[PDB]
Each structure stands twice: as structure tokens, then as C-alpha cells.
Design a binder for these strands. Structure first.
Lengths: 95, 173, 125, 242
RNA sequence: AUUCCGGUUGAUCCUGCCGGAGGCCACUGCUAUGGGGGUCCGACUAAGCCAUGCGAGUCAAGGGGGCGUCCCUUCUGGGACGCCACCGGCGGACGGCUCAGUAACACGUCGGUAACCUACCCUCGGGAGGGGGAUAACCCCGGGAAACUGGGGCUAAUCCCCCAUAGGCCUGGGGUACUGGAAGGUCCCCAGGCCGAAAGGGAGCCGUAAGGCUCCGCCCGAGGAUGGGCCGGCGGCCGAUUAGGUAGUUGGUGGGGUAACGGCCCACCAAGCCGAAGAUCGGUACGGGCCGUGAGAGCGGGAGCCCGGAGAUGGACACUGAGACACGGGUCCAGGCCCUACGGGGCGCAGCAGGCGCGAAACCUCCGCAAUGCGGGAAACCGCGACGGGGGGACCCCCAGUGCCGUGCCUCUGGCACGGCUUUUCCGGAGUGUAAAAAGCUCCGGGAAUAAGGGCUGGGCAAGGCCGGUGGCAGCCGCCGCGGUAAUACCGGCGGCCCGAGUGGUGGCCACUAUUAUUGGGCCUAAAGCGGCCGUAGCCGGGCCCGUAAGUCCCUGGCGAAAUCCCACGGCUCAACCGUGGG
């Protein structure tokens, strides 16, 4: 699986950066959220504890899976802004 | 009033049993390996809509009329039914066979990725044919001229291996 | 109550059947028969939209003006004539068209005591 | 069955001047009463979320707004139902972005970027003039705002004139009169978003509005309503309207 | 596709109707492997009746209390934050459901209100001075079967009341400063009166104090905005076996009332007003955007989505509020139910599910406020059977499957035998998806394995002169017509044809139908010229000259919401569906 970043936006009204990317993975299943987040943090040199993956969407009959994620400057702002369900899904919140 | 109801995109013959129409449609279905008569009627309706648009635009004057004429010609050329130098007169000369030739299964058979039209339909339905880098599983899809040359086996299907016995059998034809 | 809505008859002469119930906004109120008395009596009415109306039921004084802007607060004795009704003058009822008598003379009313809360009049020279 | 004011608004009945998907959802933000009409206004929530994309959900849009990070004209606005209309300046001091709200050629509202110096000017068309207590003159602008001047300056302002007003301090910069050759910009009608210079003014009996003829940069002559004609300069536009 | 075919005779040509042939909606027999998108599903008969659960709450940063924890000087009393109900503020007049009533300014459109109200919100110019009063919670005592509710003590407020001023309303005499197309309007000066405000309240940071700053707040005036009220011109259904209707009825003079004009109402004056160009009366019906059909003209429908109007078992009334004479608030009458300790006390699903009845005819007594919106709050945030998600259903559309290839056989449009191949679908699994699930999507293991029925077979109309049974009996038949011992027409067998996850039956609408005829039908003999004339309205009208632009044509501003309809492009695989532009 190869990750290619299609768009980076710097939102500072909310202290975050929005990342739109794609995963090229022919002949393989949809990558797990853990693996996607790990590779994204490794490539972008981000903080693992202040980044979330909004979604990883696999299309029909395609080897490209689209992906949307965010990276926050501060964990406090991350918790304040992001919903609880997405944090639970990403595993940041033990719940 | 009433809300919108999604109407059918194909038309049924005015008379269900006419010898000439029955024989002609039987010939077409046997040749092009269509599953049911509604596919043929859908293609006929597409043709008839094109001809109706051309007829309405021929006797129309206005800026919107010219824009629609140009758009219709461009769309037909993109579909690949008309030559690049065609005019509005050539639209009325189209036939059902022209449209039936642009079906994905027909183009697959012509390119030779399958031995027969039935095999081409099987490959399309099972996902062994890719459009661009994309897999499509609609045998009735009308391919576009701008891409017709990029149709090939999906890179993950067994038919992508020259060794595959079925691929060898297809090739030796 | 006093409904002040559409009439029940067409101008041609036919009848009209109501298609809806009476609405609270189309209701009126009983006439305020302002009478001559020894003391002023008035009440406050809350109207549509929370507005206020001052209704005079018994009137004792009157503000009389004489052709020059000068005004005097005088006492109302009796109603000489009230063309609005043939019995208002007899019953001492004050309305916008009444002609009243005061110690200074005859004065024609120019206000609406049922809507104003006061009685204003102009002397007759 | 209807007993009082409405509090909802379906997306399929939203004003045609908005840039909104009319079938993605069922409910739209009902604009709160404010400066401009509903026809030439849009709730600030849609600007924060859809137009600029700073937010993905109404919740975080409200969270952004409550921190006073969005400025309209020169005042910080926190109500997400606040209407913003034509010739309004939306400023985001944290980003340095300044936009002017203007109608495009199809009557829809769009945000045109402007400069920091321009961000402190808001033209106002004198919609009406009246008198108030103490013998003072009150001017009512196209956005519902009001100003007061002394009777000494009675003749300095007339209906259909334009006033350049610094904001949020509300100081009078200058007055652009409405005469021949005055640069104008159409804010409504079939000729919306078209600019030019005044040519002639025609009046009619009864309450029928006066009609003004305008000449565009290409020399063509068109017509519109005198109230639709918005003055923006004397010979050339004093503000950017592309 | 701007269409025809069968049927009146021994045979022919006409007029004329019936049937065949197509599309759409409702019910229904047989049958059925999937996946997507959508504005589908107790409208037709009963706007008939309902058990149970839910469908409107929010605010501790307005106020006083109670319980708990902590910090405590330490009998004192002070400070916090958790929970709790109470007063108090706002909302509950929107959203949701149904089409009864209504032939009407109810609806659509274009204009008026210079004749008017508006809580929430925006801007500008000002103000917040002095007093008073209870009462909830709490404590004591209770009753009533319940529903409910009495007495006493005690207190606070953004609770209530009063005083002052600012301010509102009327009227009279003056000046003409303002918007307007035009002032019973606005503004300025005098005169007489009536009405008549506020919470400098709360929170945070500072400051020794004083005092300061920020946030959310209160009151008056002038405008806006939102939401309305009212009014005018035009437009849209049938009956003459319904010809005269009206009597506050038409208009006026003066008043009352209304937020506002108005016979809306009152007193007084006259006889006016509507009507064969169809008043009144009667029948039916929510109006429109739109939907069905047709080459079009046109005809028919106008339940689901949007705007507007009405209703909350049938009527009539009122209180609070900006907004109601108010679906889940109140009073009474009429009808139908329920508890009762018999004294009394409650209720009406045309809200989401569910039940009874009615019927030919219509689903779960499910999960969440995560997305869109609404109310409340300074905010976080809480609530919402609105909405979002799933469940059941041959609701409408789109894309597919029930295998493919090679060889050899055959009674060759296909079945079989051998050897291969694929997994859309099927089963199991890992991820991704969802608020959580499920469905979809990528991948892995198995395997052609899990998947075709319905009508018809004389013509109209594609398909059999084949075989067994009945012998004017059973039966078939939209129409012609067939069956009487030789049935290609009935029942079945074997063949064959049309569509195909659909296919048939019944009712309705359009075309067929130039059998409603403006386009565009007929009246000598087939239906149809008054037995004949004169004339009222209406319709149709000789030639030339001049004037107006009502009709007519052209150009140009303001309109006729959105969705729906057509075209191009882009996004869900293409498509249905959505988005951006043009029409």
C-alpha cells in the first residue's frame, strides 16, 4: 500500500491541518486504521496523540482508497473540538 | 398536483407480434448476444432520442438552438458515433447497429480479449475487464472514443497472465 | 362577542357560508357610552399587540378652545344636541359630533372620548 | 391552521440567491431579522461552513463563531443566524482575509477578496431621509442602519446618494451624489452585477419607480431601477467590484 | 410510427357503433437470485373508535433553600462545586398529521395600505433617581379513595406595586424644515388635558480601599428586518326539468368599535344593488406549482414533494400572551367511554408505532440526537417518534445473475459426453464503513456449485390440421365464432411462439376516435334544416381620404419561488440519483 497526499490545508481558526490522501493498494484488502495512521505519522512527522482519521473510504472496483484525516496542534483542542465517537473509533479515548 | 415519478427509459413496440419486427429483432439479438428485448428497446430509444433532438434543432433558430446543436454534435463525436467532420445532417443517418457496436462487450470482442460475445459478457460481469485503471461490470456501457484504446484485462485478474490457459485459448483465435 | 368580520351576504343578494371559525383578531368591544357625571371615570384596555387604550365612561370636565389656541378646563352641564343619534342628546351621551353646554357657552366636541380618554371641544362664536 | 410566526425553513424553499444544495438535507437555517432583506442576505453559518470551508459541521462552526474569530463590517458577530448582505465586509483578523459580499451575474452572493485598507470602508446608499426630535435629520441606509446629522448639513445628503463610512467607528468619509456621469453598480434585477455610468433618469406618474439608464465600459446602454443603481464613485469606482 | 386491423351480405361499396392493438394508476391469481437510487405504502368505504409507551423543553452566569464532599478559625461563622425540587425568564401559536368543510378575494398573478399590529434581531440619539409589598421553597398541623387541596410562621429576586422625570395619545392656534407622484404623515413654537419606564441587575479579572476594564444584560424615541392583518384588477367547474333574487339589502350624513379602512355595528335620510354575457338556487370539489396520455391541438387527474388555505369527536365561548379564542392548555351543550370507598373525578392518536371496525384495498407497539434544523443557555451543552438509521412490503426507476470455452455426438433456433476456466451471485472469514449495528466496498478459502416462471397456440396476432378423452353434454368465447362421433378452437400429452423476475385477470383515464371536429366531422335517399316568414341582443359586414394607437407587431425595465422538464460537463463504477452553467 502506497500513500499519496493530494491536499494539505492549514486551518488555524481550529488549530489543525486537514490531510486528503489516497492509498494505492491493488490486490490487497483495505488498510486498517492503525496502519494508515502509523504510515501517515511516519511520513508527515506528526504527533501520534494529536491526529485523527476522519475516514478511509474504499470505492467500487478500484485499487485506490480515498482518505481524510486531521492533525491537531494540541490534544486539549483535539478533545474539545472532535466528537467523542470518532476519537473512540480511532482508539484515542479508552471509553 | 402530483410529485415526480421516475419514468421508464425504454419504449415497448406498438404491436407485440409483427413478423418483420420480430425477425429483425431476433437477428439483432442473436448477433449481439443481448439478454432481453428491453436492452434492445433501450438502445433503440437512445437512437430515437438522438434523432428527435436533431430534428427539433434543425428547424430551430436562436442562440440556445445553436448552442444545443454544437453540444449534440460534440456529444455524438465523443461517443464515437460520428466522424470528426460530421454535420447535423449526418445525425439522421445513424442506425441501431452503430449504437450496438459501442457496447462494452462488443468492443471487448472486437479488440479480441474474448473469443465470443458470450465470453466477453462473462468477463465484464465477473470483473476481468478494466476501463482506464477502473473495473466496470456493465455490459451495456457505451465506451467513449477518447478512451477506447485503454480497455484491457484488470491487472489483478488471472486473465492478465499470458500463461493462463483460458487466455491462451482466447489468444489462439 | 362583537364580530366585525366579513358580511354574510354578497352585494348581488346571495348568502355566504363561512369556511373558517371566527378569529380573535376580528373581535370588537362594547360601545363606551360616555355620560355627563360629577366625576371623571376611565379605564385602561389592553388591545392588539399589547397597546393601551384609555376609555372614558363618565366625563365631568372638558377642554374648550376658542379660535386662538387658548384652552380652558371647564365643566360639562348638558348635551344640547348630538346628531349622531336622536336620543344621545336626551340621555347626555358625548361623542365626537356632540354639542355641549358649558359656563362659557356652546362647544362642539372634536375628540373621541371612547378612544381618547379626554373630551376636547371648540367654542361656537 | 397557522397561528403565528414561522420558525423553520425547508431547503427546497430557500432564497434563490444562496449557494446551497437544496436536496442534500431537509432543513435550512432560517435567517434572523437583521440589516438587509432575506433576498440579499445569507446566514453567517453558511459562509463559515460552505463558502470558506473552515468548518465541516454546524457544531464546530458555532464553536469557531463563539470565540469571536469572524468580524462583519467592524463588529464581532457570534450569532450564526446573523444576515450579511450586499456591500458588506467580512474580515477574519487572525487570517488577514477580507471579503466583500457582492452579487454575481446570476444574482447569487459571492465573496470577492479585497485589501486591508479597503476593509475599513463600507458604502451605504441613503434609502430614506427624515426628521427626528430636536430638529435633526436622520438618514436610513440600504442595510437598515441609521445616522443622525444636524439641520446645518440638511442639503449635504439626499435620497439615492452614497455615503462612505469608516467602520466600526461610524465616521462619515465622503458623500457620492447621484447625478449624470456618476459611476454605479447594479445590485438587483436582470442586469445584476453590471457596472457603468449614469446617463439619464426618467420619472413616471403614480408610485411607479423611476428608471435610470446606464452606460457600460463597452459603450452599451441598458436600463434599471433608480433604487437598484448603487453609486460607488464619481468618475471611477472608489472600491473594487470585479 | 401524424398507422390500422375483425365483425351487417349469396357477393360489393358506404354510414355507424363494439372489440383487438399501446401507455399510466388501483385491487388481484401464479411465480420470484441480487444490489443500488427515490419525493412510495389505511387517500378511495369510517374527519369512525382507541389499551399501553413516547411525540416540548431549557437556564445554577436572575433568587432563596435542602442533601453531600472539601478547606477550615473552631460552639460561633465564612468560602467554594456536586445533586435536588421551588420561584423566576423564554418557548410550548413553529414543527407533526388529515382534506371534512369551503364555488369564496379560499387559490394563482400584478399592484395598494398616504387605512394597520409585530415578541425575537440590527443601527443611531438618550436614561437607569427614591421608596414599598408580599409569597414560593422551607418548618408545624392536616383532609380526601383518588383527582386535588385548607390554616399558621418565615423569607429572596431580572417577582410585584408606588413616587419623580423622560416619554406616549387627543385637541386648538401658528412656521413651513423632511420623505414622497401626491401629505389627515414627520419636524419646530405656544395652549388645555389624560396615560405614563427601567434590572446600574448578574458573571469574570484587577485594584489596600476608592475606582477601573471585559462579557452577558434593562427602559424610552426614530427607522429597518422577520412574521402577519386588510383591500383592489384579471383568471380557473357543471344544471333552464332552477327565472327572477335582495330588505342591513345598495348608497349617503353623523357616530361607535377595531391595531387599522369598511353596513363591521348603530341613528337618520333615499331606493337603490345583482340578473338570460345565466342572479338566486342545487350538484361536486381544498386552490396552485404539477402528474398521466397524445405527433400536436387537446382530454383527464390534481393523496404522497413545495407554497398557500382550513380542522383537531359535532358546536359555541372566553383567560394569558407580540402572536390563539390554542391537536398532546380552559368553560358549557350534544354524543361515546373510564376509575370510584357512590360523595365524586377524568378522556377523545386527522402525532410516531400498535389495536378494533370498515372494507377488494395499506407495514415495527425498533435504535440516536452522530449529520440538517428548531427551542433554551454567555458557552460547553440538554431535549426533539421533526429528522437521521435500520425492520416488513412484487411502490417507482437503474445495473446484473441463473455460467463460459474447446472437442465429439446427435431427433441441430438446442440437449448430451469428455477435458478445462470464472466466482457477479451462494457459504465462511479479515479489514473499511455506522452514533453503535446492518447494508455496501477491498481482499482471502470452497465451489457451476445456490437460482425460471407466466400467458398463448382458428383469425384479428407469432406460434400444430399432431396424438388420447367428451359427442350441442362438459365447456370455450374482449369480437368473429367453435363443440351435434371424424374438435389444429373444450380437457390433458408431446411440440411450438411472446415476454421473462416477471407474467396474466378485473375497474378507471388518454390514444384508437375527424365517434365532439378552432386546427378538424355531418344534415336529398343512412342520425340530423325549425311547416313558413318578420324581427330584439349577439356574430359577420361595400369603396376612397384624413386623425388617435384601443386591439396587433417590434424594442426595452419589474415580475411569474424552489423542486419538476431539456441540454453540456463533473461526483457516486456508467446509470437511476445528486452538483455546476444554459434554456
Amino acid at each position: 500500500m502506497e500513500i499519496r497526499i493530494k491536499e494539505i490545508k492549514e486551518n488555524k481558526l481550529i488549530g489543525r491541518k486537514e490531510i486528503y490522501f489516497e492509498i494505492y493498494h491493488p490486490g490487497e484488502p483495505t488498510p486498517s486504521r492503525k496502519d494508515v495512521k502509523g504510515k501517515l505519522v511516519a511520513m508527515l512527522d506528526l504527533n501520534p496523540e494529536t491526529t485523527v482519521i476522519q475516514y478511509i473510504r474504499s470505492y467500487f472496483g478500484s485499487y485506490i482508497s480515498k482518505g481524510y484525516a486531521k492533525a491537531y496542534d494540541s490534544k486539549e483542542r483535539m478533545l474539545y473540538i472532535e466528537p467523542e465517537y470518532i476519537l473512540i473509533r480511532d482508539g484515542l479515548i479508552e471509553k | 398536483g402530483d410529485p415526480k415519478r421516475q419514468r421508464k427509459k425504454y419504449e415497448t413496440p406498438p404491436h407485440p407480434w409483427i413478423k418483420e419486427r420480430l425477425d429483425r429483432e431476433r437477428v439483432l439479438m442473436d448477433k449481439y448476444e443481448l439478454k432481453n428485448k428491453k436492452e434492445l428497446w433501450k438502445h433503440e430509444t437512445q437512437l430515437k432520442n438522438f434523432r428527435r433532438r436533431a430534428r427539433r434543432l434543425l428547424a430551430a433558430r436562436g442562440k440556445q438552438a445553436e448552442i444545443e446543436r454544437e453540444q449534440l454534435l460534440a456529444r455524438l463525436k465523443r461517443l464515437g458515433l460520428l466522424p470528426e467532420d460530421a454535420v447535423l445532417d449526418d445525425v439522421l443517418s445513424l442506425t441501431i447497429e452503430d449504437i450496438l457496436e459501442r457496447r462494452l462487450q462488443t468492443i471487448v470482442y472486437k479488440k479480441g480479449l474474448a473469443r465470443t460475445m458470450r465470453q466477453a459478457r462473462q468477463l465484464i460481469v465477473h470483473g476481468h475487464i478494466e476501463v482506464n485503471g477502473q473495473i466496470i461490470r456493465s455490459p451495456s456501457y457505451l465506451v467513449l472514443k477518447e478512451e477506447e484504446d485503454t480497455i484491457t484485462y484488470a491487472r489483478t485478474s488471472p486473465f492478465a497472465n499470458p500463461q493462463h490457459p483460458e487466455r491462451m485459448m482466447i489468444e489462439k483465435a | 362577542a362583537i364580530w366585525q368580520g366579513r358580511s354574510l351576504k354578497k352585494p348581488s343578494g346571495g348568502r355566504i357560508v363561512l369556511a373558517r371559525k371566527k378569529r380573535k383578531r376580528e373581535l370588537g368591544r362594547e360601545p363606551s357610552n360616555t355620560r355627563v357625571a360629577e366625576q371623571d371615570k376611565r379605564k385602561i384596555i389592553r388591545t392588539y399587540g399589547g397597546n393601551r387604550k384609555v376609555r372614558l365612561t363618565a366625563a365631568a370636565y372638558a377642554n374648550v378652545f376658542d379660535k386662538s389656541g387658548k384652552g380652558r378646563k371647564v365643566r360639562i352641564i348638558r348635551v344640547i344636541e348630538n346628531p349622531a343619534n336622536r336620543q344621545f342628546a336626551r340621555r347626555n351621551i358625548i361623542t365626537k359630533g356632540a354639542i355641549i353646554e358649558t359656563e362659557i357657552g356652546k362647544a362642539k366636541v372634536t375628540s373621541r372620548p371612547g378612544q381618547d380618554g379626554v373630551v376636547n371641544a371648540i367654542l361656537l362664536e | 391552521a397557522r397561528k403565528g410566526p414561522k420558525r423553520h425553513l425547508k431547503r427546497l424553499a430557500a432564497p434563490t440567491s444562496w449557494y446551497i444544495e437544496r436536496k442534500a438535507y431537509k432543513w435550512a437555517v432560517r435567517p434572523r431579522p437583521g440589516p438587509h432583506n432575506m433576498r440579499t442576505s445569507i446566514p453567517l453559518l453558511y459562509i463559515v461552513r460552505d463558502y470558506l470551508g473552515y468548518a465541516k459541521t454546524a457544531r464546530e462552526a458555532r464553536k469557531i463563531l463563539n470565540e469571536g474569530k469572524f468580524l462583519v463590517d467592524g463588529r464581532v458577530r457570534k450569532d450564526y443566524k446573523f444576515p450579511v448582505g450586499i456591500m458588506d465586509v467580512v474580515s477574519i483578523p487572525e487570517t488577514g482575509e477580507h471579503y466583500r459580499v457582492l452579487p454575481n451575474r446570476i444574482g447569487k452572493l459571492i465573496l470577492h477578496p479585497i485589501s486591508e485598507d479597503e476593509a475599513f470602508i463600507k458604502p451605504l446608499r441613503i434609502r430614506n431621509k427624515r426628521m427626528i426630535k430636536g430638529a435633526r435629520v436622520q438618514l436610513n441606509f440600504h442595510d437598515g442602519t441609521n445616522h443622525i446629522v444636524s439641520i446645518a448639513e440638511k442639503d449635504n445628503y439626499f435620497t439615492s446618494y452614497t455615503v462612505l463610512m469608516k467602520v466600526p467607528e461610524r465616521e462619515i468619509l465622503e458623500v457620492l451624489p447621484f447625478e449624470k456621469g456618476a459611476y454605479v453598480f447594479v445590485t438587483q434585477g436582470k442586469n445584476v452585477a453590471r457596472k457603468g455610468r449614469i446617463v439619464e433618469i426618467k420619472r413616471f406618474p403614480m408610485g411607479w419607480p423611476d428608471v435610470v439608464t446606464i452606460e457600460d465600459e463597452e459603450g452599451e446602454l441598458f436600463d434599471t431601477l433608480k433604487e437598484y443603481a448603487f453609486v460607488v464613485g464619481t468618475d471611477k469606482p472608489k472600491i473594487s467590484l470585479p
